[PDB]
Amino acid sequence: DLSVWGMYQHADIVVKCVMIGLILASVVTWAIFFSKSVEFFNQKRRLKREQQLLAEARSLNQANDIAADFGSKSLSLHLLNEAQNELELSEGSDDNEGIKERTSFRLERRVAAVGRQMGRGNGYLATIGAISPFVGLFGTVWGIMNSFIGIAQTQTTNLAVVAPGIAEALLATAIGLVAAIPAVVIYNVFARQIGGFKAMLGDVAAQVLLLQSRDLDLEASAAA
Amino acid sequence: MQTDLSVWGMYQHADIVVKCVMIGLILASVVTWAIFFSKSVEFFNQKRRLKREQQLLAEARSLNQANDIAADFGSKSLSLHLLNEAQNELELSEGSDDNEGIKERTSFRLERRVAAVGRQMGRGNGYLATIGAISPFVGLFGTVWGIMNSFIGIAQTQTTNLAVVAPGIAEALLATAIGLVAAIPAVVIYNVFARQIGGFKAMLGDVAAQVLLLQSRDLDLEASAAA
Amino acid sequence: DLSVWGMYQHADIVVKCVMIGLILASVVTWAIFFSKSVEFFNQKRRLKREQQLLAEARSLNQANDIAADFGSKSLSLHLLNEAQNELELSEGSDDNEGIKERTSFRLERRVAAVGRQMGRGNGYLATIGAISPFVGLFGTVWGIMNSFIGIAQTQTTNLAVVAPGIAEALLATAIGLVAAIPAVVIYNVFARQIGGFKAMLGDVAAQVLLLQSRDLDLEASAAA
Amino acid sequence: DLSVWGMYQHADIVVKCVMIGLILASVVTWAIFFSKSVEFFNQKRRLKREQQLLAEARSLNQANDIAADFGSKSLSLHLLNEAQNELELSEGSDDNEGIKERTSFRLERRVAAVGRQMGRGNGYLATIGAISPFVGLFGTVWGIMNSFIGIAQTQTTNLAVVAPGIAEALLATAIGLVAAIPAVVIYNVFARQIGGFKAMLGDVAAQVLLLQSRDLDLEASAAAH
Amino acid sequence: TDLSVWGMYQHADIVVKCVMIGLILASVVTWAIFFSKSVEFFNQKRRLKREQQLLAEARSLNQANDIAADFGSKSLSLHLLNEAQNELELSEGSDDNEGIKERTSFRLERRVAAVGRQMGRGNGYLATIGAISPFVGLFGTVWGIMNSFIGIAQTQTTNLAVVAPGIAEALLATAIGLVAAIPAVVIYNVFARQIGGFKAMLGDVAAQVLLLQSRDLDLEASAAAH
Amino acid sequence: DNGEMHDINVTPFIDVMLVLLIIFMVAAPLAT
Amino acid sequence: NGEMHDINVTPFIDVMLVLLIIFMVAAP
Amino acid sequence: PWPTLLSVCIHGAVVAGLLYTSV
Ligand SMILES: CCCCCCCCCCCCCCCCCC(=O)O[C@@H](COC(=O)CCCCCCCCCCCCCCC)COP(=O)(O)OCCN
Ligand SMILES: CCCCCCCCCCCCCCCCCC(=O)O[C@@H](COC(=O)CCCCCCCCCCCCCCC)COP(=O)(O)OCCN
């Protein structure tokens, strides 16, 4: 009768709902891990390839001629297009400091938007890492209340009658930590991956601002 | 005590210090759910509106186009409110020639409005953060009182039968249970609204940035056309 | 013969000093609450009312004429004087953007200084909140330890001999948490109300900067 | 049984070593408090005097004439010399905004460096205050574990037979609390006082930047006629 | 039956065994990281302190290059001076000194942040081991508790002395949890502070490069105007 | 910072130890 | 800013281990 | 002042309740 499976089968409906709720939270944290680890791998591998190619550029025109290789989903091509588009919208301006402030402001907004989009799942993972111990240990407290009420409903004088009820309860904390531990590991892995990726993307965006700013000053100096 | 017991009978025999603890936590959870239903409806309405306003402004290529497109928006629209904040900085600068002055003042005004709207949108969040942080320890205090009352029972009766320790462990369980039932929703709802505030302040910042880009570009083009 | 008072009467001299110390920490945290709560309410109510009046102004002259009656300890009058004083220290300057920089910097110092000065007394709330659990717990550990040190001499085999001393000990955790919870709630409440007050005072200081900035640029155009 | 020496001598090495470690953490937190509080109090007391004298000054030359009587370790005299030295190094410049931004940047760095130097002991205090409870918990978990081994080996027990074992565990907890409580109090007292000091030093640095910036503008105006 | 810490580990359930081994390996990693990072931080702190002290006499960016030319290739201050001199050689045609100053300031701030990121390598293990190793132990306790109550039920026993070995397993799984957790949390807080102090010292060196460049550009411009 | 979880939670250890205490408070009166 | 202000009840874990012993050993 | 007197009075009032209820 009594086993790690068998003690689920006859547990109270409240602790069955707690255990099933934590098993669903476990399945979701693993689904997020397999989904996002592939996304970070492809997004970081592409961004590394693109940055290592753009590193030889000396002008924004040369950077556009390099970046035309990249597919329409490319973050580097999307940052070059945001900078080039500010020239195309601004062609009547003889003020260059305006083009610099508008481009700088628009690229930092795009880098923040991509960084915020990469972080999609992390709010769930931090929630499951925070609550799962408490949700599981609430399952135990209700199981212990039922065990203790069971003594008052059927008066008894030996612990071997209630010991199954203690095991049936304590399993809800075991499943609580088994849900919590992956969620905290996976969350820390992605918090560190995102920090490195936002910085790598910011270093690409910084190269675009440097290329544009240097080209505007050299073009203005050619009026001498 | 230990005959035909129920969870409500367990509350009926509790000490008056542990009744006040768990009644206080029940009320704190009722206010938690009242904030969740109130704020989640407001975030849905505000975010659903602001997303529409941003999509309707995406084709704008001058501050005059943004102003006319936005004239159709309701008087409560944050996007129209930011455009009026920028338009008013022109109509209070009319005699000046210092376009850099106009740009820095408008940047400062819109930054202050975006901060103020975010600060107002967060109205209830400090209550939620308080319950999520403190209710575990309010529950713990009730457990300590129940455990203490179990030793008062042993001392007053001069014996260790389950019947004399039972009233204390009974109310210690309830104080733990209600402590968790207050804590868990408050932590979940606080993380949801912290995520919803981050997403909303960012989207409002993108609208305010579009207004600044439109104004800055339009002034520089007007100045070049004068030259 | 036990009760919450009788336990304090029949306690060790170290547990009495812990309990009296925690009750004095409770008296202090509630005295700070009633003192600061009235001060913050009055200053919030005044500053909001002054901001509603100054929202009508369209020049720094009109603003400091509107403020001229405000009490000698008014924060918006203090900010308007601090802007007017940078002008009267600068009367020889043809450089306007230097005045805009110097006033912007000086008002930032003062808005921060008011928020810092308003935060006086919070170090007690933070300290009482952090240590009261540990001071109550020390009372419990000591009370339990003194009881078992006794049984280790008497050799008595019955739990009812120590049980009074154990209850007298757990009571010092209960008093420890009663001193702790208000202090940690109230610390967070005032940390948040200082944040909101500093933000509102920043919105008032911004109006002074905008009025001064507008007037300097309009005056420069009128001279030209 | 009878005394704290009785618990200390008849304690498992693991628990004894935990108690020595917590006693040394208690010694170091008091050593930090007495060492740092006297020199910090003298910096705080001096800096407040320097600011009260400099608040009279209305040109950077007048501020040097006020400050020249200050001791060679005065932070205010350092900030005045640090600003004056930017004029010394820039004498061939006709650009003032360069002198302002270089001075602003150099004083910001100087103020931050003093901020790091003043806070230098805090890592011990914050660590000992947060961690000593868990080191105490390891000591009690270990002493309590040994008492369950005692029950499991003897298999005939009463609450007096285990009383030495739990008295040793409680003593390791008590020493943990006696390390933790002073460390949190001392850490919060310094966290407040350092914040007030960095703010006061920042307002002296702000006065030097304001005086220099205003003086350059009035000189640049006078040079036009 | 042996109740030494070894005999206790030898009697424990497979779930508790692999928890204890996992925590022990996490402590081996926590110290292997500590000795690896500390020897590197000590060498990089000692090196950068000497370089800053030796750059302090530089009157001009040319003197700073001539001083730094003797520094070995991995030198962070030589690397910062190369970033500053490279922004000049990339923009010789430019006449906007303010741009060069802005572009150089942006490059050096980015470089200092990148050295901070590179120096923070491996700290994610210390944070994770510090956060999870308590819980991982807790789980080892609760599994030991469950096995002991299942043992009470299966055997129908009523003397509580039979569970004393079982709860000693649970207490040991707690203890090894703290032994993994506490060093990892202390060492993470230590390296977080050492990196902040190092970023500040490297920032003070990067600031001297900007001050030298900015002053040389301004002095060159006034001499050319005269 | 980057938002890593990097510190002991304190409260999950209290609450599980609280139930470990309570299960032995109900069990020990039912032992020999 | 930088003050320690959070509740830390961790020594009550140690107290609960001691009550866990005294209830274990005081069985009837 | 008024804030310390109010605080010590309301805590005086609750401990007077412990004196009463313990008789
Ligand atoms: C031993 C534990 C139990 C007893 C001791 C602790 C009791 C709780 C202490 C609560 C002190 C509260 C002081 C009043 C502050 C009010 C300030 C304010 O205006 O609102 C705050 C918000 O409110 C709070 O922070 C209230 C927190 C209440 C905590 C209550 C916990 C349960 C206590 C149960 C025991 C008492 C039972 C009494 C009998 C039913 C701050 O503003 P906000 O932006 O953060 O939120 C605005 C939207 N509401
Ligand atoms: C089961 C648990 C067993 C105990 C485990 C204890 C912790 C083990 C890890 C110890 C690591 C020690 C690292 C020392 C680094 C020293 C760095 C330095 O040179 O000194 C700094 C000053 O020292 C530190 O910051 C040290 C921080 C405290 C570490 C020691 C206390 C740990 C807790 C109590 C241990 C005793 C009890 C355990 C007994 C077994 C100087 O300033 P900074 O900028 O480099 O650092 C920030 C402060 N300005």
Side-chain angles (χ1 to χ4, degrees):
Chain A
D1 48 1
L2 186 63
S3 73
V4 64
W5 170 245
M7 76 177 71
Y8 173 87
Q9 297 192 298
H10 55 259
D12 186 28
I13 187 61
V14 176
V15 307
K16 286 178 171 174
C17 290
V18 168
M19 287 184 278
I20 293 296
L22 290 163
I23 290 296
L24 265 289
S26 181
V27 170
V28 177
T29 186
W30 285 110
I32 293 169
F33 177 67
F34 300 133
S35 178
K36 292 200 67 60
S37 57
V38 173
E39 181 181 57
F40 286 121
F41 178 77
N42 285 330
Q43 288 286 358
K44 196 171 68 174
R45 183 172 60 83
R46 290 169 69 83
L47 184 63
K48 176 58 62 71
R49 170 231 315 240
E50 293 173 352
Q51 182 184 17
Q52 186 173 355
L53 260 63
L54 285 174
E56 77 183 318
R58 302 291 82 101
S59 67
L60 196 72
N61 291 354
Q62 188 181 16
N64 289 336
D65 292 346
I66 292 163
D69 176 63
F70 311 157
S72 60
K73 295 184 179 179
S74 171
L75 301 175
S76 311
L77 181 61
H78 196 99
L79 281 171
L80 271 307
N81 287 174
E82 293 278 3
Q84 171 60 22
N85 175 255
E86 190 57 34
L87 304 183
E88 292 173 5
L89 290 179
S90 188
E91 293 189 328
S93 188
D94 60 346
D95 186 319
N96 299 308
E97 299 92 290
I99 297 174
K100 294 176 187 170
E101 293 179 353
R102 286 176 274 122
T103 307
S104 179
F105 187 39
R106 181 144 106 236
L107 297 202
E108 75 166 39
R109 294 273 50 182
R110 176 63 55 180
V111 172
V114 176
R116 189 174 66 252
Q117 183 274 355
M118 292 299 292
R120 192 78 80 192
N122 280 34
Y124 183 86
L125 295 169
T127 303
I128 297 312
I131 78 177
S132 298
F134 309 145
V135 171
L137 62 80
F138 175 76
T140 73
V141 173
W142 188 265
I144 299 313
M145 286 168 56
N146 288 346
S147 180
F148 170 62
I149 288 169
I151 301 166
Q153 286 290 356
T154 291
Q155 189 161 232
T156 192
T157 65
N158 81 76
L159 88 170
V161 169
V162 305
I166 304 304
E168 289 158 35
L170 270 280
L171 177 63
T173 282
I175 292 169
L177 285 318
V178 169
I181 289 155
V184 178
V185 175
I186 292 159
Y187 175 82
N188 274 358
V189 171
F190 294 156
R192 183 152 283 255
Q193 292 273 30
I194 291 163
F197 184 84
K198 288 195 306 181
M200 190 186 300
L201 183 65
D203 292 344
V204 171
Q207 190 186 359
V208 180
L209 298 179
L210 290 166
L211 288 168
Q212 187 201 51
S213 181
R214 199 180 301 119
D215 285 355
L216 290 170
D217 295 344
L218 292 169
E219 177 63 15
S221 303
Chain B
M1 181 54 175
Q2 64 172 51
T3 297
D4 195 16
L5 187 61
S6 70
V7 177
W8 185 90
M10 214 179 296
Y11 164 71
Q12 197 196 5
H13 297 298
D15 182 297
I16 193 50
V17 170
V18 184
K19 294 184 190 281
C20 290
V21 166
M22 80 179 79
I23 288 291
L25 287 170
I26 286 160
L27 294 176
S29 81
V30 171
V31 175
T32 297
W33 290 112
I35 291 166
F36 173 70
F37 298 130
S38 177
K39 293 305 310 302
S40 59
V41 169
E42 186 65 11
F43 282 124
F44 180 85
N45 288 338
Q46 293 290 1
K47 189 167 56 68
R48 189 271 294 272
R49 188 194 297 269
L50 185 65
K51 175 59 65 71
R52 194 202 73 151
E53 315 304 52
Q54 185 183 16
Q55 286 183 343
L56 289 169
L57 284 176
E59 60 258 40
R61 289 192 171 199
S62 70
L63 193 68
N64 293 339
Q65 286 178 0
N67 289 357
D68 62 58
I69 289 161
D72 188 53
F73 298 155
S75 63
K76 305 305 299 290
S77 181
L78 299 170
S79 184
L80 176 60
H81 207 64
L82 293 171
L83 280 164
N84 290 170
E85 191 82 45
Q87 179 63 30
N88 178 250
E89 189 48 43
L90 301 179
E91 90 199 335
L92 294 176
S93 300
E94 328 91 290
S96 73
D97 58 351
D98 190 344
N99 298 316
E100 281 58 61
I102 294 178
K103 287 180 288 186
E104 76 174 4
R105 286 196 293 277
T106 307
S107 178
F108 188 31
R109 287 180 62 178
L110 296 174
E111 172 54 27
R112 297 254 42 58
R113 300 324 301 300
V114 172
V117 172
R119 186 171 62 240
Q120 178 272 357
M121 197 64 62
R123 179 58 58 76
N125 289 23
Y127 175 90
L128 293 168
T130 302
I131 301 311
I134 272 68
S135 87
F137 306 114
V138 175
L140 181 66
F141 165 83
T143 78
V144 170
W145 203 275
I147 290 162
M148 181 187 79
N149 280 342
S150 90
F151 288 107
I152 302 298
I154 291 162
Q156 288 283 117
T157 62
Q158 298 285 298
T159 188
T160 187
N161 301 106
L162 180 60
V164 310
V165 76
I169 75 90
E171 73 193 356
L173 288 164
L174 265 58
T176 314
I178 303 300
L180 294 160
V181 170
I184 292 158
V187 171
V188 174
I189 295 155
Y190 179 70
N191 290 153
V192 171
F193 294 159
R195 180 55 57 135
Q196 289 283 0
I197 284 287
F200 190 83
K201 288 195 306 181
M203 189 189 305
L204 188 66
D206 295 354
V207 173
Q210 188 182 5
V211 177
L212 285 166
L213 293 170
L214 287 172
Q215 187 201 48
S216 177
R217 200 179 306 116
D218 194 47
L219 289 169
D220 297 348
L221 266 287
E222 184 68 5
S224 178
Chain C
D1 49 348
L2 297 176
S3 61
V4 175
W5 182 248
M7 292 157 72
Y8 166 74
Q9 287 191 316
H10 189 81
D12 188 3
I13 191 51
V14 177
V15 177
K16 294 180 189 283
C17 290
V18 163
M19 288 174 61
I20 294 160
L22 290 165
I23 287 163
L24 267 292
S26 188
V27 172
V28 169
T29 191
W30 285 102
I32 292 167
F33 176 73
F34 297 124
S35 180
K36 295 192 72 69
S37 179
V38 170
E39 182 173 77
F40 287 11
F41 170 76
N42 283 333
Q43 293 190 12
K44 180 71 172 184
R45 184 167 60 84
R46 191 190 301 124
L47 183 63
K48 188 170 63 176
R49 187 264 292 179
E50 290 174 358
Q51 182 182 4
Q52 286 165 183
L53 293 174
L54 286 171
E56 182 54 26
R58 297 190 180 200
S59 69
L60 189 69
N61 289 79
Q62 186 181 27
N64 87 84
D65 289 342
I66 286 161
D69 59 358
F70 296 163
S72 60
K73 54 180 162 69
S74 165
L75 295 170
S76 65
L77 184 278
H78 184 65
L79 291 169
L80 282 163
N81 283 177
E82 196 147 57
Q84 180 51 60
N85 177 252
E86 193 61 34
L87 275 295
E88 87 197 333
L89 291 172
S90 305
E91 292 185 328
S93 185
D94 288 342
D95 184 336
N96 299 302
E97 58 274 22
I99 301 170
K100 293 186 287 187
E101 285 181 1
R102 284 183 269 113
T103 302
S104 175
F105 180 44
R106 190 179 184 182
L107 301 196
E108 191 277 336
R109 300 313 301 165
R110 190 50 45 59
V111 174
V114 173
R116 185 177 64 245
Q117 179 269 99
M118 178 174 277
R120 284 178 297 157
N122 280 27
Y124 299 115
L125 295 170
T127 303
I128 290 163
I131 80 179
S132 295
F134 289 151
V135 173
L137 262 298
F138 179 82
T140 74
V141 168
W142 184 271
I144 296 166
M145 185 172 72
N146 284 54
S147 69
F148 284 95
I149 287 178
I151 204 154
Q153 295 172 83
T154 68
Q155 322 309 325
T156 54
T157 64
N158 182 1
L159 177 64
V161 178
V162 303
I166 303 300
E168 289 157 30
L170 272 308
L171 188 275
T173 288
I175 300 299
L177 295 173
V178 170
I181 307 313
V184 180
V185 172
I186 292 159
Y187 176 79
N188 279 284
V189 166
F190 292 148
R192 201 160 36 243
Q193 289 177 2
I194 292 162
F197 186 85
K198 190 193 303 179
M200 168 171 265
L201 186 63
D203 300 347
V204 174
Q207 182 157 237
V208 180
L209 295 180
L210 292 164
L211 288 166
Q212 184 214 236
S213 173
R214 186 185 312 304
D215 286 350
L216 289 169
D217 298 355
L218 264 67
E219 179 66 6
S221 179
Chain D
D1 51 358
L2 184 63
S3 69
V4 175
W5 176 254
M7 285 93 82
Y8 174 98
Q9 77 84 15
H10 199 89
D12 174 58
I13 170 62
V14 173
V15 180
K16 217 193 310 297
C17 185
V18 164
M19 286 160 47
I20 294 169
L22 290 166
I23 287 164
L24 292 179
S26 183
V27 169
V28 175
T29 188
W30 286 111
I32 290 164
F33 175 69
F34 297 128
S35 179
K36 198 176 63 166
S37 185
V38 299
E39 70 94 342
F40 175 86
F41 166 77
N42 280 286
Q43 295 286 37
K44 183 79 179 301
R45 184 176 64 87
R46 178 162 55 225
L47 181 61
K48 189 168 64 74
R49 184 196 70 178
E50 319 301 54
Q51 187 183 18
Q52 289 291 346
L53 297 175
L54 282 168
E56 176 55 23
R58 221 163 299 283
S59 73
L60 190 68
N61 295 335
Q62 187 179 23
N64 290 338
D65 296 343
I66 293 290
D69 294 343
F70 293 155
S72 61
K73 290 185 291 287
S74 178
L75 299 172
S76 71
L77 179 62
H78 285 198
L79 293 169
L80 271 308
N81 292 161
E82 198 82 41
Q84 171 58 17
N85 179 247
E86 198 63 31
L87 284 298
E88 295 178 329
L89 295 179
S90 310
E91 293 179 353
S93 184
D94 63 348
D95 185 317
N96 300 306
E97 297 93 295
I99 295 170
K100 292 177 186 172
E101 76 178 23
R102 286 177 277 121
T103 306
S104 178
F105 188 36
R106 189 142 107 299
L107 299 201
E108 170 181 306
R109 299 255 53 122
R110 195 75 142 119
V111 172
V114 177
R116 298 191 308 262
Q117 184 172 8
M118 207 59 56
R120 186 171 59 84
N122 282 11
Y124 294 100
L125 299 176
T127 304
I128 289 169
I131 296 298
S132 300
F134 297 110
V135 173
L137 175 62
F138 168 72
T140 57
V141 164
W142 198 273
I144 293 285
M145 186 182 74
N146 288 352
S147 77
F148 289 124
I149 279 79
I151 293 159
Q153 289 183 340
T154 59
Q155 306 188 11
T156 289
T157 51
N158 64 54
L159 83 173
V161 171
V162 304
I166 56 182
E168 291 155 30
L170 290 160
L171 189 281
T173 320
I175 296 294
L177 283 157
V178 168
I181 292 160
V184 175
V185 176
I186 292 160
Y187 176 73
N188 279 354
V189 169
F190 288 128
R192 297 285 281 183
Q193 288 289 1
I194 294 289
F197 182 85
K198 288 194 304 182
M200 182 172 286
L201 185 63
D203 291 350
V204 174
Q207 192 187 359
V208 180
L209 296 181
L210 288 165
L211 285 171
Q212 187 203 55
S213 179
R214 197 181 301 122
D215 189 39
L216 288 172
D217 295 345
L218 294 174
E219 177 56 24
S221 174
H225 343 272
Chain E
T1 305
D2 184 20
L3 288 160
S4 77
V5 177
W6 179 246
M8 190 150 46
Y9 169 87
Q10 285 187 302
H11 191 271
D13 190 19
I14 184 60
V15 175
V16 179
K17 276 178 166 54
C18 66
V19 159
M20 289 176 181
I21 295 298
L23 290 166
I24 286 165
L25 268 288
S27 80
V28 171
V29 170
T30 227
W31 291 111
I33 292 171
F34 175 72
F35 298 124
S36 179
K37 297 302 299 288
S38 301
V39 171
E40 188 62 19
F41 285 12
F42 176 78
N43 279 289
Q44 291 212 4
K45 190 80 176 290
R46 183 176 64 84
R47 188 176 193 147
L48 181 65
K49 176 61 65 71
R50 180 169 60 82
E51 290 177 357
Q52 182 178 16
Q53 181 61 19
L54 183 57
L55 280 168
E57 52 258 44
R59 302 297 85 180
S60 66
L61 194 69
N62 294 331
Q63 285 189 354
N65 289 335
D66 294 345
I67 289 164
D70 293 339
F71 304 160
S73 181
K74 305 309 303 292
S75 169
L76 296 170
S77 66
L78 182 279
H79 191 69
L80 288 168
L81 282 160
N82 286 179
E83 292 270 30
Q85 180 277 337
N86 178 248
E87 191 57 37
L88 294 164
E89 88 196 343
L90 282 177
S91 67
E92 304 180 300
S94 172
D95 52 359
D96 189 2
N97 299 300
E98 282 56 59
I100 310 179
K101 288 183 286 187
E102 175 57 17
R103 285 173 275 121
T104 307
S105 179
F106 187 50
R107 284 178 59 178
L108 301 199
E109 198 285 321
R110 192 150 293 297
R111 181 54 63 179
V112 172
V115 176
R117 285 174 268 125
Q118 189 274 0
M119 185 170 280
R121 186 184 301 279
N123 286 26
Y125 300 115
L126 297 172
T128 304
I129 292 164
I132 81 175
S133 61
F135 289 151
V136 171
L138 218 59
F139 169 82
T141 85
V142 169
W143 195 271
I145 300 309
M146 287 203 299
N147 283 359
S148 76
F149 278 100
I150 296 162
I152 286 166
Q154 288 180 124
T155 61
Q156 307 291 356
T157 45
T158 58
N159 180 356
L160 207 65
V162 310
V163 48
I167 61 198
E169 313 305 341
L171 271 287
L172 181 61
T174 317
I176 301 302
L178 284 314
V179 172
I182 296 164
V185 175
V186 170
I187 293 157
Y188 183 86
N189 288 344
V190 166
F191 291 151
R193 290 177 186 282
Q194 294 226 306
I195 292 163
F198 189 86
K199 282 180 64 179
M201 189 161 74
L202 187 68
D204 298 349
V205 172
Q208 193 192 358
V209 180
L210 297 177
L211 291 167
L212 290 167
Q213 187 201 47
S214 176
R215 193 159 47 244
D216 284 353
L217 287 169
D218 298 348
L219 267 291
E220 179 66 11
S222 72
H226 170 269
Chain F
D1 58 336
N2 68 355
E4 283 161 11
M5 294 175 68
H6 65 274
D7 200 0
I8 303 181
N9 201 2
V10 167
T11 184
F13 314 104
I14 290 281
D15 285 344
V16 76
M17 185 55 58
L18 190 290
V19 303
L20 258 60
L21 174 279
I22 295 290
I23 65 181
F24 276 91
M25 285 182 76
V26 300
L30 302 176
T32 60
Chain G
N1 299 20
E3 301 98 306
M4 288 170 72
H5 73 272
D6 290 315
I7 301 170
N8 187 337
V9 211
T10 52
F12 190 58
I13 304 168
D14 312 47
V15 172
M16 288 186 289
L17 277 313
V18 173
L19 286 323
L20 170 61
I21 282 287
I22 71 105
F23 279 115
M24 171 91 181
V25 176
Chain H
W2 82 265
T4 56
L5 272 291
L6 199 176
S7 184
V8 78
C9 289
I10 188 166
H11 296 172
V14 78
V15 74
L18 280 311
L19 266 294
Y20 165 61
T21 53
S22 62
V23 182

